């Protein structure tokens, strides 16, 4: 019941303490059908070169560590042939499968929230100001919340309790989420369809969603348990189309 395997492209994920699989709203990723489509030309569908498991660098869960957030896409923009089609094409569409992997022993304790947020529009630190783009996303390097209210121009107000969007950080359970309770499971999987209000949308301009990992109950251990507990995030596109080819963008 706890074993599971996810085979996408030329990549596989094995797990032995999985709780379940959140499918975002009961909905699986699918291709754009003929009657909901708006672009005239034929789309590219690479299907095995792009819909595989790309692994982002891992973060160290410390005893006093507020949280982390990534923005998808713009995290996978330098990942293989997803981040290349994504350059050469104007319009892109894709769902994802997010597998978060954090393992500890039976003498450790903790609890992460793993939550995908659609359109996680964020709030600058100076109330009368504007974010950067760097302040929303570093690529594959995660941005970090803060245990107190942050200052400084153009940088998101990243106190954890508000989650940078101005809401309560405990109500985030309305979004597709899981927990990683180091006493029961050691991985969370969320299957995320293409949620957006236009059929296809550009991939550099719009951060389609945000993955937040927030430890509610912090780490702890005793005499000489292992001090280093890392968290690794793997994302895998699904049903990925692109449309509108031309010369490659540049930033």
């Amino acid at each position: 019941d706890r074993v599971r395997s996810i085979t996408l492209g030329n990549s596989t994920i094995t797990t032995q303490e999985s709780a379940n699989v959140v499918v975002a709203y009961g909905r699986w990723p699918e291709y754009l059908k003929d009657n909901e489509a708006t672009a005239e030309d034929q789309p590219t569908q690479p299907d095995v070169a792009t819909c595989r498991f790309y692994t982002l660098e891992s973060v160290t869960w410390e005893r006093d560590s507020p949280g982390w957030w990534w923005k998808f896409p713009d995290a996978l923009k330098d990942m293989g042939l997803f981040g290349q089609n994504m350059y050469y094409h104007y319009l892109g569409r894709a769902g994802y499968t997010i597998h978060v992997q954090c393992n500890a022993s039976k003498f450790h304790q903790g609890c992460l929230m793993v939550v995908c947020v659609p359109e996680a529009e964020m709030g600058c630190s100076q109330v009368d100001g504007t974010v950067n783009e760097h302040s929303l996303s570093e690529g594959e390097t995660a941005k970090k919340f803060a245990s107190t209210s942050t200052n400084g121009t153009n940088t998101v107000q990243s106190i954890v309790t508000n989650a940078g969007m101005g809401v309560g950080v405990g109500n985030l359970t309305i979004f597709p989420h899981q927990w990683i309770n180091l006493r029961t499971n050691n991985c969370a999987t969320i299957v995320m369809p293409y949620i957006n209000n236009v059929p296809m949308d550009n991939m550099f301009r719009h951060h389609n969603f945000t993955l937040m990992i927030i430890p509610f109950v912090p780490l702890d251990y005793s005499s000489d348990s292992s001090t280093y507990v890392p968290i690794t995030v793997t994302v895998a596109p699904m049903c990925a189309e692109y449309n509108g080819l031309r010369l490659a963008t540049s930033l």
């Binding site: 003498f107 304790q109 005499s223």
Partner: protein, 59 residues
């Protein structure tokens, strides 16, 4: 906006036997509580919420 006519009660939590841990695990643990409504809940008589408020336009 409950008063002491339509009061509802109070919940309370107590140890029944206690926490027991082996050697080498931490002693101070944490619980957490999630509230939701059952499948027979209902609300009525729309009103305004007291939680949002402004002091001029453009807000």
């Amino acid at each position: 906006q409950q008063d002491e006519y339509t009061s509802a009660g109070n919940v309370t939590c107590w140890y029944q036997t206690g926490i027991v841990v082996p050697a080498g695990t931490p002693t101070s643990c944490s619980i957490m509580c999630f509230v939701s409504a059952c499948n027979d809940f209902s609300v009525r008589l729309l009103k305004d919420t007291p939680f949002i408020e402004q002091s001029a336009l453009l807000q």
